[PDB]
Design an enzyme around this catalytic site. Structure first.
Site, PDB file in Angstrom:
ATOM      1  CB  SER A   1      -0.883   0.010   1.237  1.00 11.36           C
ATOM      2  OG  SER A   1      -0.042   0.178   2.373  1.00 11.36           O
TER       3      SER A   1
ATOM      4  CD  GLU B   1     -12.006  -0.642  -5.486  1.00 12.41           C
ATOM      5  OE1 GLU B   1     -10.855  -0.204  -5.247  1.00 12.41           O
ATOM      6  OE2 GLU B   1     -12.734  -1.144  -4.608  1.00 12.41           O
TER       7      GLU B   1
ATOM      8  CG  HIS C   1     -10.041  -4.526  -3.624  1.00 13.08           C
ATOM      9  ND1 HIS C   1     -10.239  -3.238  -4.075  1.00 13.08           N
ATOM     10  CD2 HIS C   1      -9.094  -5.066  -4.427  1.00 13.08           C
ATOM     11  CE1 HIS C   1      -9.424  -3.003  -5.085  1.00 13.08           C
ATOM     12  NE2 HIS C   1      -8.712  -4.094  -5.313  1.00 13.08           N
ATOM     13  N   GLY C   2     -10.601  -6.785   0.090  1.00 11.86           N
ATOM     14  CA  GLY C   2     -11.176  -7.059   1.394  1.00 11.86           C
ATOM     15  C   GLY C   2     -11.524  -8.514   1.580  1.00 11.86           C
ATOM     16  CB  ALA C   3     -10.322 -11.364  -0.187  1.00 13.35           C
ATOM     17  CB  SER C   4      -8.910 -10.874   5.642  1.00 14.43           C
ATOM     18  OG  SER C   4      -7.545 -10.625   5.348  1.00 14.43           O
TER      19      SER C   4
ATOM     20  CG  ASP D   1      -3.362  -2.836  -2.047  1.00 14.03           C
ATOM     21  OD1 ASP D   1      -4.353  -2.802  -2.820  1.00 14.03           O
ATOM     22  OD2 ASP D   1      -3.422  -3.163  -0.830  1.00 14.03           O
ATOM     23  CG  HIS D   2      -6.564   0.295  -2.579  1.00 16.29           C
ATOM     24  ND1 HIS D   2      -6.502  -1.083  -2.589  1.00 16.29           N
ATOM     25  CD2 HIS D   2      -7.877   0.614  -2.687  1.00 16.29           C
ATOM     26  CE1 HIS D   2      -7.726  -1.575  -2.675  1.00 16.29           C
ATOM     27  NE2 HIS D   2      -8.579  -0.567  -2.720  1.00 16.29           N
TER      28      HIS D   2
HETATM   29  O1  LIG Z   1      -8.033  -5.388   0.238  1.00 20.88           O
HETATM   30  C1  LIG Z   1      -7.033  -5.388   0.955  1.00 20.88           C
HETATM   31  C2  LIG Z   1      -6.933  -6.271   2.186  1.00 20.88           C
HETATM   32  O2  LIG Z   1      -8.174  -6.835   2.558  1.00 20.88           O
HETATM   33  P1  LIG Z   1      -8.386  -7.403   4.070  1.00 20.88           P
HETATM   34  O3  LIG Z   1      -8.464  -6.199   4.984  1.00 20.88           O
HETATM   35  O4  LIG Z   1      -9.661  -8.197   3.980  1.00 20.88           O
HETATM   36  O5  LIG Z   1      -7.204  -8.287   4.278  1.00 20.88           O
HETATM   37  C3  LIG Z   1      -5.867  -4.522   0.587  1.00 20.88           C
HETATM   38  O6  LIG Z   1      -5.934  -4.236  -0.805  1.00 20.88           O
HETATM   39  C4  LIG Z   1      -5.885  -3.185   1.334  1.00 20.88           C
HETATM   40  O7  LIG Z   1      -7.102  -3.087   2.077  1.00 20.88           O
HETATM   41  C5  LIG Z   1      -4.721  -3.033   2.315  1.00 20.88           C
HETATM   42  O8  LIG Z   1      -4.890  -4.030   3.323  1.00 20.88           O
HETATM   43  C6  LIG Z   1      -4.675  -1.672   3.004  1.00 20.88           C
HETATM   44  O9  LIG Z   1      -3.399  -1.567   3.639  1.00 20.88           O
HETATM   45  P2  LIG Z   1      -2.959  -0.211   4.409  1.00 20.88           P
HETATM   46  O10 LIG Z   1      -3.542   0.937   3.603  1.00 20.88           O
HETATM   47  O11 LIG Z   1      -1.456  -0.323   4.378  1.00 20.88           O
HETATM   48  O12 LIG Z   1      -3.500  -0.280   5.826  1.00 20.88           O
HETATM   49 NA    NA Z   2      -4.890  -3.960  -5.311  1.00 19.13          NA
HETATM   50 ZN   LIG Z   3      -8.553  -3.059  -0.808  1.00 19.15          ZN
HETATM   51 ZN   LIG Z   4     -11.024  -1.164  -2.964  1.00 13.57          ZN
END
Ligand SMILES: O=C(COP(=O)(O)O)[C@@H](O)[C@@H](O)[C@H](O)COP(=O)(O)O
Ligand code: NA
Ligand SMILES: [Zn+2]
Ligand SMILES: [Zn+2]
Ligand SMILES: O=C(COP(=O)(O)O)[C@@H](O)[C@@H](O)[C@H](O)COP(=O)(O)O
Ligand code: NA
Ligand SMILES: [Zn+2]
Ligand SMILES: [Zn+2]
Lengths: 293, 293
Positions: free
Chosen positions: A49, A134, A196-199, A82-83
Site C-alpha cells: 500500500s 476498481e 478486495h477485502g478478502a480476509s 495496492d490502492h
Molecule cells: O483489500 C485489501 C486487504 O483486505 P483485508 O483487509 O480483507 O485483508 C488490501 O488491498 C488493502 O485493504 C490493504 O490491506 C490496506 O493496507 P494499508 O492501507 O497499508 O493499511
Molecule cells: Na490492489
Molecule cells: Zn482493498
Molecule cells: Zn477497494
C-alpha cells in the site's frame, strides 16, 4: 522471478484459479509470504500500500522483494502497488520497479474514473507494467459499465465491487456477496478479476489472537466458502492483509505475555512469521494456486 | 558510503573518539540506526551476529544495508560480522559483501587464537576487508600478548577483555572495568580497540521497559561515565545491542498493553523505531562520533 502482474493473472484467468495478493510492511511479513509460496509451489502477488511504501521507503520495498525473488528464482512474483491514489504515485511505483500498479478512482463518476485509469494504463503499459482499477462502491458494480470500462481503458484486471470491504469488520449482519453480479462482470469483460477485502479471519487465527489477550469484538471476515465461490465466479487476484496481521501480532502478544524479560526481537518475530506463513499456505491451497509453478 | 571498517575506525583511533557498533536483525532496527546517524552526522558501524545472519539470510542482511547506504550516501558505513566463530563464516561474510569481520577465538590459547586470526586476516585483507579479533576472557587481557598478537596477526582492531560481558546482567555487584590494562594495551598496540558488552541500560530505557510491564531482573549495564572513560583510554568501537532491544521491545509491549484491538504492525514498530533511534543518537553524542562526517 519478478514479472509483469498480467503474466501471473492471465494464467489464473485461463485456468480458473485465484492467486492471493499478500500485503507486506517489512522483512518478516515478506519472508513468511515467500516461504509459503515456496512450500506450496505457488505463484506470488506481493503488494504494498501507499502507507506501507511510506513506512519502508519505496527503495526498500522494491529492494527487499528483488532480493527475495533472487532467493527463490523459480517462483513467479509480481510486485504490486495496492490502492494507488494518484497518477503520480503509480508513476513513482513504475519508476521504482513495481511490475503491477493499482489506481483506485472508484469514488469518481464513471467518466472520470475511466479517464484517470486510462492515463495510468498508458503510462504503465509504455513501461511494461500491468494495471488494476476498481469499479463500484459499497452502488455495487454495474456490469455493463465494467464491460465498457475495460474495453476503453485497456486495464489488465478489474476489481468489481460486489460487497466486500477492508479490515476485520466486514459485515454487521450475515456475510453477503453479489455473485450474480460477479458472474456478469466476468462474462462481459473476460479479463482477470480482483477481490478486495478478502480476509477470512480463520477460527484458529481468531482463537490465537484472543488467547493472547487480543480483542476482535464484532469482527467478521469473508467465509472460506465465499472465497471459493468467488474464484468459481472468476476472481483471480485475492487481496489479503488483515488475516496476516492478526496471525502475526497474536504471536507477538503471546511472547510478551509469557516472558516479561524477553526482548530479543527474533523470539517475538520467528513464531509470528510461522503463523503468518501458515495462513498464506492455507490460503494458497484454498484459492487453487498451490502446485501451479 | 559502504566502506572498509578500518576507514572509520582509523579516524576514530587517531582523533580519540568512539564509534558505536550497532547490531540489527531486521529492517526496523536498521532504519532507526541509520536515521540516528543521519540526524547526528555520525559515521555508522552496522553489525550482524551469526544468529542475525541466519534469521535474515546473509543476502538480505547485506542487501538491506546497501539500500540504506544508497539512501544516505554521505554517511560512512561499515558492515561488520559480529562474533564470527569460524573461518568459513568469516569467508562467507567477505564473499557476501561485508566490509569488516570479527573472528572470536579468544577461548583458545594464545597460539591457536593467533593462528586462526592470522588465517582470517590473510583471507579478508586479500579481499579488502578489515578484521577484528579478541584477546582475554572474563583471565583478562595480557597487554604484552596483545602487543605481539597485533604485530604478528596484522589484525586491524582488537577487543581486549577488560571486564565487560554481553547482555543485560553485566555486574553482579558494582560496575568495574580495568582501565589501567586498557591504557597499556592501547600504548603497546597503537591500533583501534573494541569494547564488547557495552550497553548502558539507561535509566529512561529501563523505566520505559518496566512501565510497559517488562522485567529486567536486576540487570546492570556499563555506566555512561565508564563508556566515556573507555573512549578516553583508547576504545574506538563500542558494541551496542541490548540497549537497542530493550528500548524497541518496551514500545512494542506498551502498544500491546494499551490497545488490545491493535494489529497494524506499523503501529507497534514506529514508536519502537523512535525509541531505538533516540538511544543511538544519545550514544553517538556520548561516544564522540556526532558531527564527525
Ligand atoms: O483489500 C485489501 C486487504 O483486505 P483485508 O483487509 O480483507 O485483508 C488490501 O488491498 C488493502 O485493504 C490493504 O490491506 C490496506 O493496507 P494499508 O492501507 O497499508 O493499511
Ligand atoms: Na490492489
Ligand atoms: Zn482493498
Ligand atoms: Zn477497494
Ligand atoms: O558485544 C555485543 C553487544 O553487547 P551488549 O549486550 O552490551 O549490547 C555484541 O557484539 C554481541 O554480544 C551481540 O549482541 C550478540 O548478538 P546475538 O548473538 O545476535 O544475540
Ligand atoms: Na564485533
Ligand atoms: Zn560481544
Ligand atoms: Zn566478546
Amino acid at each position: 522471478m519478478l514479472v509483469k502482474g498480467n503474466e501471473i493473472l492471465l494464467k489464473a484467468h485461463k485456468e480458473g484459479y485465484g492467486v492471493g495478493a499478500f500485503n507486506f510492511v517489512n522483512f518478516e511479513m515478506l519472508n513468511a509470504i515467500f516461504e509459503a509460496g515456496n512450500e506450496e509451489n505457488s505463484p506470488l502477488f506481493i503488494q504494498a500500500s501507499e502507507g506501507a511504501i511510506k513506512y519502508m521507503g519505496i527503495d526498500m520495498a522494491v529492494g527487499m522483494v528483488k532480493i527475495m525473488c533472487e532467493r527463490y528464482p523459480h517462483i513467479p512474483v509480481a510486485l504490486h502497488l495496492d490502492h494507488g491514489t494518484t497518477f503520480e504515485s503509480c508513476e513513482k511505483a513504475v519508476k521504482a520497479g513495481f511490475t503491477s500498479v493499482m489506481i483506485d478512482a472508484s469514488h469518481h463518476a464513471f467518466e472520470e474514473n475511466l479517464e484517470l485509469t486510462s492515463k495510468v494504463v498508458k503510462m504503465a503499459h509504455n513501461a511494461g507494467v500491468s494495471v488494476e482499477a476498481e469499479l463500484g462502491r459499497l452502488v455495487l458494480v454495474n456490469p455493463k459499465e465494467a464491460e465498457q470500462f475495460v474495453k476503453e481503458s485497456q486495464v489488465d484486471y478489474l476489481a468489481p465491487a460486489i460487497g466486500t470491504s477492508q479490515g476485520a469488520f466486514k459485515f454487521k449482519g450475515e456475510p453477503k456477496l453479489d455473485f450474480e453480479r460477479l458472474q456478469e462482470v466476468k462474462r462481459l469483460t473476460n479479463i482477470p478479476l480482483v477481490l478486495h477485502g478478502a480476509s477470512a479471519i480463520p477460527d484458529n487465527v481468531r482463537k490465537s489472537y484472543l488467547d493472547a489477550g487480543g480483542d476482535l469484538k464484532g469482527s467478521k471476515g469473508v467465509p472460506f466458502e465465499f472465497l471459493q465461490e468467488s474464484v468459481k465466479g472468476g476472481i483471480n487476484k485475492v487481496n489479503t492483509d488483515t488475516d496476516l496481521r492478526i496471525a502475526f501480532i497474536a504471536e507477538v502478544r503471546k511472547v510478551a505475555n509469557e516472558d516479561k524479560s524477553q526482548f530479543d526481537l527474533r523470539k517475538f518475530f520467528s513464531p509470528a512469521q510461522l503463523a503468518l506463513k501458515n495462513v498464506v499456505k492455507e490460503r494458497m491451497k484454498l484459492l487453487g494456486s498451490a502446485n501451479k509453478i
